[PDB]
């Protein structure tokens, strides 16, 4: 096929329409991406906060092993339990 | 050019006319593909991080309950642990 300048004009409009839709999708995905990066940073800060508490409790239990305290022994079993 | 005999072009001349626009479309399509993949990886990473938060939080809550249940002992070591549990920053 050889094509009219009018069919080209409509072909150009089609491409411009799809370009607008893909730009919208980029904007939506960039906003989502920014929110996910914030959420992972905040979640990792909570992990570090809680992990620090567990490490300090571990140190207190280790320092008091001489006491032979069954309550501290139960806490050590919680600290060292797997998932 | 008349309405009977309009200017008519090859699909190759059209390709060269539209090539710049098709190149810009390709930039945004590839950006969509890259961002969709990134976002899927981030959603998995947040699920795994939230599971670790729940795991550690469960340990802290269970230790809290044991400390509360033994408050009658007046044990300064348990009091140090409760200080850790209830401490900020």
Residue numbers in the entry:
A (entry chain B): 24 to 106
B (entry chain A): 18 to 106
From the paper:
In line with this, the primary structure of lamins reveals a central α-helical domain responsible for the CC formation which is flanked by non-helical N- and C-terminal domains called the head and the tail respectively.
Crystallographic data for the LA 17-70-Eb1 fusion construct were phased by molecular replacement, relying on the dimeric Eb1 cap as a search model. The crystal structure was refined to 1.83 Å resolution. The first α-helical residue is Arg28, which is in line with earlier predictions. Interestingly, the side chain of Thr27 stabilizes the N-terminus of the α-helix by making a hydrogen bond with the main-chain nitrogen of Gln30. First, residues 23 through 27 corresponding to the proximal residues of the head domain form a β-strand, facilitated by a Pro residue in position 23. The second unexpected feature is that, consistently for both dimers in the asymmetric unit, one of the two chains reveals a sharp ~50° change in the α-helical axis direction (‘kink’) at residue Leu35.
